[PDB]
């Protein structure tokens, strides 16, 4: 379906990375975070739905997701919660050098991960497509 | 044209807000930044440029597009600069929902969220986010 996404976290360097995957695409928003709290949590998922038509959430189920503000920022957005990170963990690889930040070598990684064309559509082409179409 | 994107600052509450809007369609992104640099500027063009197709970007043209880091983040991600009203329903926006949030970077992801889901024209009509992935597929 069009509308569900999956969000996993990956811990590299000491930090924190939210990743949401669109499963339909495999297309990518990624985010460090500073810490995995219900708040960063909530307003990582508030960033995502207000940029792409989300639907369903599948997530790890853990403690970040049980508290007051997370539920909050859910239901206001109509959110219902019902491998890939280790290729954006190589590609974050190959780019750490060329950044003094984690945030920014992540935030290439996803620019890569999103443009790639490996018949023969990036995840970005493809997210578009889907989404288009159920419209 | 399904390329094209408009980038402006807009100042609240002693802090920046950059929004980029895809032209065509009237879809925004927008952050609030630690302050108007080249290094903030790059980092947010390279975030919107990895999930959107960033061809072009039209900027005010100051101070902060004319250092290493920002020049340096557009070649790598292949964004060109060309040539340099949104801003202010965004300012509505945000008013209207200030108050239900902590800290406004949370209002700006509200007033986000709301911009791009909002049916222009009513029933029949099509959100920003709509337009958008419409403009983009057809292109594709
Ligand atoms: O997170 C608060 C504030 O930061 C933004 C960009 O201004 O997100 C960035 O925050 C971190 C800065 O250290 C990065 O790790 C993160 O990946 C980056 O996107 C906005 O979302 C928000 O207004
Ligand atoms: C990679 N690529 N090549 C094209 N012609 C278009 C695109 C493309 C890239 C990203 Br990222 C997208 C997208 C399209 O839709 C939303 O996100
Ligand atoms: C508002 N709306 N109503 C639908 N049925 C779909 C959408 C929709 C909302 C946002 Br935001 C989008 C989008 C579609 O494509 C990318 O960003
Ligand atoms: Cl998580
Ligand atoms: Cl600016």
Redesign the interface.
Known sequence: SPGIWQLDCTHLEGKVILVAVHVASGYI?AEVIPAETGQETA?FL??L?????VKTVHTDNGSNFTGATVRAACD??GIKQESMNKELKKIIGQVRDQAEHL??AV??A??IH??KRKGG?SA??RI??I???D?
């Open positions: 928003e307003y508030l960033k739905a207000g940029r792409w038509p206001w957005a945030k920014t935030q290439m996803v620019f999103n443009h559509y970005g082409e578009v497509d989404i288009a179409t419209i």
